[PDB]
Amino acid sequence: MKELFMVRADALNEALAGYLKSKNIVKLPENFDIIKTSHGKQRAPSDKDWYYKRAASIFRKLLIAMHEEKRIGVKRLSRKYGCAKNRGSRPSKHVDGSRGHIRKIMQDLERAGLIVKDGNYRKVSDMGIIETGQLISQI
Amino acid sequence: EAVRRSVTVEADVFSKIERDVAKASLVTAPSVAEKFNLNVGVAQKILEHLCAGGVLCCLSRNSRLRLYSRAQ
Amino acid sequence: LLLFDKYSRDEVVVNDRSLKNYIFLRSLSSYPHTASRKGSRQFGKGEIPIEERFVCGLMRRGRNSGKKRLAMAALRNAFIIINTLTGKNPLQVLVDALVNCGPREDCARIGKGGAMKRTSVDVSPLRRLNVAIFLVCKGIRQACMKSTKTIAEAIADELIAASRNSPNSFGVKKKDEIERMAKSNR
Amino acid sequence: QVFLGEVMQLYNKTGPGGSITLCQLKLEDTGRMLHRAVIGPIKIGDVVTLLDCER
Amino acid sequence: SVDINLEGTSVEEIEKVCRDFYAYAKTLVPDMGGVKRLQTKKGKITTRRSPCGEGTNTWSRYRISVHRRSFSAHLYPSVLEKFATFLKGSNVEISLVIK
Amino acid sequence: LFETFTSEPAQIQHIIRMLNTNIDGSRRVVHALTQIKGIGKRMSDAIVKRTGVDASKRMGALSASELELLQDGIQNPAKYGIPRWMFNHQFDAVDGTDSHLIGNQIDANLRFYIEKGKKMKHIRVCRLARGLKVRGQRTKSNGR
Amino acid sequence: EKKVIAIGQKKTAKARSECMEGDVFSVTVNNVPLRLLPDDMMASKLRDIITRVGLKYFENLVFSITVRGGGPVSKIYAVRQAFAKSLVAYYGTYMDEWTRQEIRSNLLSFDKFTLVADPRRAEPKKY
RNA sequence: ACCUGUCUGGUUGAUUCCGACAACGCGUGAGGCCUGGGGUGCAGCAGGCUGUGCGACGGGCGGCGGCAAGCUGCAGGAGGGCAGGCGAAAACAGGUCAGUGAUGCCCUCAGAUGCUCUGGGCUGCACGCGCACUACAAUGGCGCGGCGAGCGGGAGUGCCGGGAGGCGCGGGCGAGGCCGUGGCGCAGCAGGGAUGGGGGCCUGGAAGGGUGCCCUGAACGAGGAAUUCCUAGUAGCCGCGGGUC
């Protein structure tokens, strides 16, 4: 997927996140407005639509892992969404992301048919390939 | 010395700083916050508002600093 | 080739014959960052560009150690405010800051015997440039620490006030403070 | 008034630290050759600025 | 399908082993693969020198490194046995996988 | 151009009296609400998001209508859909009902805590009655 | 058809480059085109090489640069060395050689590390 | 007794060498050496791997010194004092009897100075001191998006949960940060995270241990006399992994 990269990365993200919100294919949890998103974070995310903006970021990470011909799970994906925890007087150690909402945000990407599992790894499917193709045609 | 710069606009500084930024060549958001007693947070959105009007053209859009100069 | 894609290094006139050897104005990169091994050859501080010598003076006081990308981004901003406040080439206003802040004569203690006498000492051109960099990077940092001034403004504040000699700039009121101690002992 | 001085000869690093060296200094238009103590790093072929107004 | 795997800590011994084995393998087969050398699996132990706390932080680093060599072919099991009899005068550890 | 200027409010009360606390109108509502003893930077993000007042408004600029939308949001946060695990004083020792202590309630709980412990000869409040460090901390070198 | 591979590297950042006789000049470093690089210092350190050599030598040459390892800034000098090394290796293979000597002399006088590796590695002290 | 050898001088990191010399010849140490690091020749094989070599000697050139040793600048060059390793003779009443099935001697051996179990202590605290950690913030902090190392190469996965964590399969990993951007905006303030309260967990037989959530939010606004470390991919900043477990 060479044409994935030939548009701007963050400009892809709200175009992707606004797609997942408009098509209603990712569903909000009950406590979405108060999730720390890691145990290293100090506040909840300030953005009201942070949940979609992450769903665009996760689906982009599965897109590039398919471009690298590599399989990615939820636990390895949380490491990409971890920050460095202010541990008080101790040195600030890197901690992992919150796995719980990442698992549900990928299950909604299975319901839309974007992400189809291959063995024990979920992979991007042809439906995810096509629907990105109209998006990056428009960016 | 404790300073807490006013987070308000009193309808007399806004035309005062609009006359002031029309005077100067280049102004930045912390500079009006020191020359006047404004928070630089409200001073940031004023100069974006004077960029929305035909008062000053946007120079550099960076998160560290947003620079503004007079139009034409 | 132009600095920051905007400013030409070629049309920068260092008027001082003393510092013309050491202020490096040969266009080698659009950015200040050239990771060259010029410190090893014992005089190559006059071979890395003056803006790279300047941004290395910024990244100071421990917490900013080595943050050159932060400094030259905060100089990329600092040259736009300078150029649109003055019209001059911001490299030309930078070299005019350092020739107006390097102390030409200094006070030091010299004695071959056990008794040492404080005497006036002439300053080398490369030392004159080294401590011109040091005095303005102190005044930039100390004026932007616990105030509403940013790093990108305090560069623009000091280097403008250093280029037109005035007691506001921290460099020349420390340069003249140094040279007064030379006349204090001679 | 400041007089610029070109260094032809370097000898005798002195002082406590050894930074200060005595350098035989040429003036441009006159040619008058004078020793002078210079603190920083110096090379033969540099030009130094003197402001002592006495020598 | 034979996988001749051999591991050794001494390198001047394990190079004499692969040399005489390749002198033995070219007598057998010309489709024999060349000797492939896998990653030298190396390990270090860092240890305080003093048996007490009187000295400076004097740390002695001891290292072990085992060198691996491999051979791959598809031969007859009687040839595998005469290969096996050949590599028992060698102190290199020998293990074989027939898959 | 003041009238076409919209974003930041013209007149703001400098301090607001609420729940026996003074909260500065200069701060924005999530940062202003944390001056209340018992409301931190995480709980105030929860209260403003659940109630629905604008976080981008300075707190003194708030009307009395949305201000009473915040004080009941503080008093019973379980009404405003806030989960149990984000509470100050949850799973109580006597009543056993999850709650969130605000203002003078914490110290009156804390004054009750040392008072009930000194009656029962509790060691942990006995060191706290003498100001000694009572957790796993070391007390030879530091805390002097 | 025509394709060369040359590698340049900083501290532990290694960078391959592949130069081909494509339709139009393009530099897609790490599968990302040069105009859409998020790091502008990555882009400008490529662009001043094009400014030094001049755009006429990059007429039809497509550079698909990949980089791995190292940090942010050592990745800049990894590809900057690898971009110039693959440029001169294309002229040495597929074009006339006296221009390649003309180009190499242009770059070596410009900056030494554009075409040769910086031997300066992370050399850690002991305790 | 001792001295010369083992030195007037020059030189070297080196008692390294040049040289003059009642000394001449040797030997340890130094060097040579061994390991890693960069450059590429060949060979073999498949975040590429490991064999074999080459490559630098201060060689060339200029100037000093000239039986000179050498020093110094430049060119060439991937490289012109790279980082380690072994490390002489003599010492010291240096430390270790608490590493030892290494041990002399002295003392103890049944109400034991033996072993083992349980509990407590080694973590007590008006105080003095060493080394570090985190800071005092705007060159910052917080929230998202983007890009992201090496040593070490075993581990991810699916599901539940807000987090910690849990469960079931199971050949299998990557950081602070930086960039972009939103908020705060000089405030003991969204700096700082000490102390304390309530809840959830992990390990273990056992929490004073660790972790997670909420809340409380201390001193500290640049630190006296003093004093440490450091010359280039170094100091510093910044994490990561391993030993312990």
PDB file of C-alpha atoms in Angstrom, chain B residues 12-72:
ATOM      1  CA  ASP B  12     -11.294  49.507  26.570  1.00  0.00           C
ATOM      2  CA  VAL B  13      -8.116  47.455  26.251  1.00  0.00           C
ATOM      3  CA  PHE B  14      -9.324  45.659  23.113  1.00  0.00           C
ATOM      4  CA  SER B  15      -9.407  48.849  21.076  1.00  0.00           C
ATOM      5  CA  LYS B  16      -6.287  49.938  22.936  1.00  0.00           C
ATOM      6  CA  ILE B  17      -4.298  46.900  21.871  1.00  0.00           C
ATOM      7  CA  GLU B  18      -5.798  47.039  18.358  1.00  0.00           C
ATOM      8  CA  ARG B  19      -4.389  50.543  18.099  1.00  0.00           C
ATOM      9  CA  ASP B  20      -1.158  49.194  19.574  1.00  0.00           C
ATOM     10  CA  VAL B  21      -0.742  46.271  17.181  1.00  0.00           C
ATOM     11  CA  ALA B  22      -1.590  48.592  14.289  1.00  0.00           C
ATOM     12  CA  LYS B  23       1.291  50.757  15.489  1.00  0.00           C
ATOM     13  CA  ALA B  24       3.923  48.040  15.872  1.00  0.00           C
ATOM     14  CA  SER B  25       5.427  45.983  13.071  1.00  0.00           C
ATOM     15  CA  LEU B  26       5.380  42.521  14.659  1.00  0.00           C
ATOM     16  CA  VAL B  27       3.623  41.500  17.867  1.00  0.00           C
ATOM     17  CA  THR B  28       3.488  38.132  19.636  1.00  0.00           C
ATOM     18  CA  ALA B  29       1.064  36.748  22.217  1.00  0.00           C
ATOM     19  CA  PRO B  30       3.432  36.943  25.247  1.00  0.00           C
ATOM     20  CA  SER B  31       4.425  40.513  24.367  1.00  0.00           C
ATOM     21  CA  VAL B  32       0.913  41.916  24.759  1.00  0.00           C
ATOM     22  CA  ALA B  33       0.615  39.877  27.947  1.00  0.00           C
ATOM     23  CA  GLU B  34       3.507  41.797  29.479  1.00  0.00           C
ATOM     24  CA  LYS B  35       2.877  45.245  27.982  1.00  0.00           C
ATOM     25  CA  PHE B  36      -0.681  44.941  29.244  1.00  0.00           C
ATOM     26  CA  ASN B  37      -1.876  42.901  32.212  1.00  0.00           C
ATOM     27  CA  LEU B  38      -3.568  40.181  30.196  1.00  0.00           C
ATOM     28  CA  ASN B  39      -3.211  36.464  30.466  1.00  0.00           C
ATOM     29  CA  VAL B  40      -1.363  35.228  27.411  1.00  0.00           C
ATOM     30  CA  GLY B  41      -4.180  32.707  26.981  1.00  0.00           C
ATOM     31  CA  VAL B  42      -6.752  35.407  26.318  1.00  0.00           C
ATOM     32  CA  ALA B  43      -4.039  37.396  24.510  1.00  0.00           C
ATOM     33  CA  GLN B  44      -3.547  34.436  22.178  1.00  0.00           C
ATOM     34  CA  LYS B  45      -7.186  34.362  21.106  1.00  0.00           C
ATOM     35  CA  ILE B  46      -7.344  38.136  20.668  1.00  0.00           C
ATOM     36  CA  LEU B  47      -4.582  38.149  18.069  1.00  0.00           C
ATOM     37  CA  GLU B  48      -6.227  35.219  16.307  1.00  0.00           C
ATOM     38  CA  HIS B  49      -9.403  37.298  16.325  1.00  0.00           C
ATOM     39  CA  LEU B  50      -7.509  40.249  14.889  1.00  0.00           C
ATOM     40  CA  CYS B  51      -6.160  37.836  12.293  1.00  0.00           C
ATOM     41  CA  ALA B  52      -9.749  36.875  11.460  1.00  0.00           C
ATOM     42  CA  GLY B  53     -10.462  40.539  10.977  1.00  0.00           C
ATOM     43  CA  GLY B  54      -8.389  42.545   8.554  1.00  0.00           C
ATOM     44  CA  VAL B  55      -6.122  43.867  11.297  1.00  0.00           C
ATOM     45  CA  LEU B  56      -2.992  41.679  11.131  1.00  0.00           C
ATOM     46  CA  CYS B  57      -1.757  38.864   8.896  1.00  0.00           C
ATOM     47  CA  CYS B  58      -0.681  35.540  10.360  1.00  0.00           C
ATOM     48  CA  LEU B  59       3.078  34.989  10.139  1.00  0.00           C
ATOM     49  CA  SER B  60       4.057  31.620  11.584  1.00  0.00           C
ATOM     50  CA  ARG B  61       1.675  29.026  12.952  1.00  0.00           C
ATOM     51  CA  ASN B  62       3.679  27.061  15.511  1.00  0.00           C
ATOM     52  CA  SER B  63       2.645  25.653  18.853  1.00  0.00           C
ATOM     53  CA  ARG B  64       5.629  27.262  20.560  1.00  0.00           C
ATOM     54  CA  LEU B  65       4.859  30.710  19.168  1.00  0.00           C
ATOM     55  CA  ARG B  66       2.340  32.277  16.818  1.00  0.00           C
ATOM     56  CA  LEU B  67       3.734  35.419  15.213  1.00  0.00           C
ATOM     57  CA  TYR B  68       1.635  38.317  13.947  1.00  0.00           C
ATOM     58  CA  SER B  69       2.383  41.383  11.842  1.00  0.00           C
ATOM     59  CA  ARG B  70       0.282  44.258  10.559  1.00  0.00           C
ATOM     60  CA  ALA B  71      -1.474  43.785   7.243  1.00  0.00           C
ATOM     61  CA  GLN B  72      -0.089  45.389   4.056  1.00  0.00           C
TER      62      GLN B  72
END
